[PDB]
Amino acid sequence: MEMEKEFEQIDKSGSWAAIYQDIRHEASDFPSRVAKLPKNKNRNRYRDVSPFDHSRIKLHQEDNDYINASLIKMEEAQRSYILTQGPLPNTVGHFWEMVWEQKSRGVVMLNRVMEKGSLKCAQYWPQKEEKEMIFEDTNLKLTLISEDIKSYYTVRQLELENLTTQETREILHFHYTTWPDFGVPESPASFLNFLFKVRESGSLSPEHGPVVVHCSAGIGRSGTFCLADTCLLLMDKRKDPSSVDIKKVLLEMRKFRMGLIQTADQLRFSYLAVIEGAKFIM
Ligand SMILES: O[C@H]1CN[C@H]2Cc3c([nH]c4ccccc34)[C@@H]1C2
């Protein structure tokens, strides 16, 4: 079926939970043996969210190459994404090592450091120009260059220096700051505006390594971001845009990381975002 009318048909019939449970039943199950090794327990935020072995990002280290991060490679859309958990106190150096080694231009953050009164990720970037951060375990230096605070999101320019080679690179930090502590946004308008700002920066384009996107577990809000982006790109590329099937795209993405889209409300919000987004593109 088309999307906008499939949408109203699920609303009128109130069957979002049944649709979402079908997706959960059909989703791929691949091994995640490296994630579950005992030496990696303090590298995982949640015991039930792990990268598959076949698609995990490897650190360029011979001691321990493990990080909780996955490469989502979308062949028809010609887009790639790295989805990862919010960094832990003992993985902030690994996080920036990954950004460096994978040649990423942009980092997309969809959570606040504290939500619901608890810490959802480490404070992993510097908050003042004159107070830079050094990650001694991976030999990197990170400096805040500029910050632009808007009503729904903040954009930061960062300098990452590899202290071993003295090479430097400019990284863009795109921080969506207004996702509610509970539920999903009422309108997709600010989330779509944010997606378009990331696109306009070049961070999603083939001349760079894959964008790094995270929330707390790296599957819910993060899944919503890449699902909406890929569906909108396919609607622009195909002769028949009504042929794009958001449930089929989501199941394709779940071949590369488990659990993408965590609730039936996030599934409905993803439909809404693609529907409204397709009208603005034209
Ligand atoms: O109620 C329907 C209206 N038309 C479509 C778009 C749309 C819907 N709900 C929304 C809420 C906020 C923004 C846009 C929408 C449903 C489907």
Curated annotation (Swiss-Prot):
Modified positions (N-acetylmethionine) are: 1
User: How is the polypeptide modified once translated?
Assistant: Oxidized on Cys-215; the Cys-SOH formed in response to redox signaling reacts with the alpha-amido of the following residue to form a sulfenamide cross-link, triggering a conformational change that inhibits substrate binding and activity. The active site can be restored by reduction.
Q: Name one GO cellular component term.
A: cytoplasmic side of endoplasmic reticulum membrane
Q: Which residues form the Tyrosine-protein phosphatase domain?
A: 3-277
A GO molecular function assigned to this protein is: enzyme binding
Per the record, residues carrying Phosphoserine are: 50, 242-243
Q: Which residues carry this modification: Cysteine sulfinic acid (-SO2H)?
A: 215
Entry-annotated residues carrying Cysteine persulfide: 215
Q: Which residues carry this modification: Phosphotyrosine?
A: 20, 66
Give the main EC class. Answer: hydrolase
Q: Which family does it belong to?
A: Belongs to the protein-tyrosine phosphatase family. Non-receptor class 1 subfamily.
According to the record's subunit comment, the protein's assembly and interactions are:
Interacts with EPHA3 (phosphorylated); dephosphorylates EPHA3 and may regulate its trafficking and function. Interacts with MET. Interacts with NCK1.
- Function (record text): Tyrosine-protein phosphatase which acts as a regulator of endoplasmic reticulum unfolded protein response. Mediates dephosphorylation of EIF2AK3/PERK; inactivating the protein kinase activity of EIF2AK3/PERK. May play an important role in CKII- and p60c-src-induced signal transduction cascades. May regulate the EFNA5-EPHA3 signaling pathway which modulates cell reorganization and cell-cell repulsion. May also regulate the hepatocyte growth factor receptor signaling pathway through dephosphorylation of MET.
Protein name as catalogued: Tyrosine-protein phosphatase non-receptor type 1
Organism, by scientific name, is: Homo sapiens (Human)
Shown residues within the full chain: 1 to 282 of 435
